[PDB]
Amino acid sequence: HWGYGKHNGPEHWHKDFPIAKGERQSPVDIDTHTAKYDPSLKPLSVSYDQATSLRILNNGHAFNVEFDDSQDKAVLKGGPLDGTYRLIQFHFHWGSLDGQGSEHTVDKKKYAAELHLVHWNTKYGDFGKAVQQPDGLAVLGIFLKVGSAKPGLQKVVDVLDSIKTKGKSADFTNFDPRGLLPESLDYWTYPGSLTTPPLLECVTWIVLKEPISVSSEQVLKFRKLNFNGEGEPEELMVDNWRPAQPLKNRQIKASF
Ligand SMILES: C[C@H]1C[C@H](N)c2cc(S(N)(=O)=O)sc2S1(=O)=O
Numbered sequence: 456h457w458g459y460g461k462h463n464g465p466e467h468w469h470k471d472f473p474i475a476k477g478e479r480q481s482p483v484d485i486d487t488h489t490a491k492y493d494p495s496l497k498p499l500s501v502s503y504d505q506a507t508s509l510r511i512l513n514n515g516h517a518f519n520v521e522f523d524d525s526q527d528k529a530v531l532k533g534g535p536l537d538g539t540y541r542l543i544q545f546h547f548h549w550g551s552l553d554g555q556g557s558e559h560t561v562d563k564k565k566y567a568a569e570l571h572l573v574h575w576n577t578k579y580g581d582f583g584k585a586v587q588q589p590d591g592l593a594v595l596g597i598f599l600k601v602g603s604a605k606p607g608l609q610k611v612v613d614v615l616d617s618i619k620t621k622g623k624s625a626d627f628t629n630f631d632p633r634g635l636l637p638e639s640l641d642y643w644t645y646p647g648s649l650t651t652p653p654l655l656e657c658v659t660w661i662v663l664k665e666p667i668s669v670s671s672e673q674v675l676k677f678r679k680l681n682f683n684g685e686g687e688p689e690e691l692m693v694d695n696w697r698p699a700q701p702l703k704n705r706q707i708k709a710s711f
Pocket residue numbers: 571573594648649650651652653
């Protein structure tokens with residue numbers, strides 16, 4: 456099955472998921488001098504004060520923090536979105552070295568990691584139906600660069616010994632996502648897809664201009680996780696990111 460190594464990595468995914476060669480694949484490089492300022496784009500509205508985190512889980516390719524999405528508790532609206540998108544989970548993509556890790560790049564510059572806050576369009580009723588639609592999901596992408604510690608990330612960093620290998624989980628309640636937002640909600644946005652299998656082209660990408668910073672020792676702990684399940688050859692979970700894909704006639708709009 457798919458992974459990120461030499462034999463099962465991004466360049467092989469097309470054989471099992473033929474849409475990997477499609478029209479609106481993600482990530483992409485954001486060329487800032489060709490992104491079009493669009494004055495009709497509304498400001499983002501992130502209402503995350505009611506968020507209920509439930510679990511953190513290592514799934515073999517990253518770790519997800521899962522949220523209760525049975526009611527409009529943490530939602531995203533505004534920006535390029537029509538209607539309410541509900542937060543279901545967030546995960547990161549990171550590298551083995553600080554100058555790689557992000558999926559989206561900005562003028563070909565790579566960051567140390569990228570956070571994806573995954574939301575689904577409530578008019579389709581459940582997540583399963585939303586991935587059958589072109590505007591079914593919105594992922595909010597935030598870049599991470601190494602510098603000062605981000606206080607709000609430390610509770611996640613501390614539970615990671617508890618989920619070191621594939622399949623493990625831990626209860627992870629009362630985590631507030633607002634502690635991972637940068638100061639500015641300025642964004643670029645373009646129509647894309649999931650960046651891991653099944654690579655469904657259902658996503659409205661909203662990538663924030665401003666990186667949050669995290670310390671070197673906060674990023675180092677991400678690299679101690681394992682792709683492998685318990686009691687197998689140790690395989691450090693580093694470099695779980697997809698290279699930039701062709702823009703193919705999409706336009707990236709900027710809110711600034
Ligand atoms: C069911 C999951 C299937 C994939 N593992 C996936 C990848 C996501 S990304 N890297 O594009 O933000 S969101 C997501 S999901 O649809 O939640």
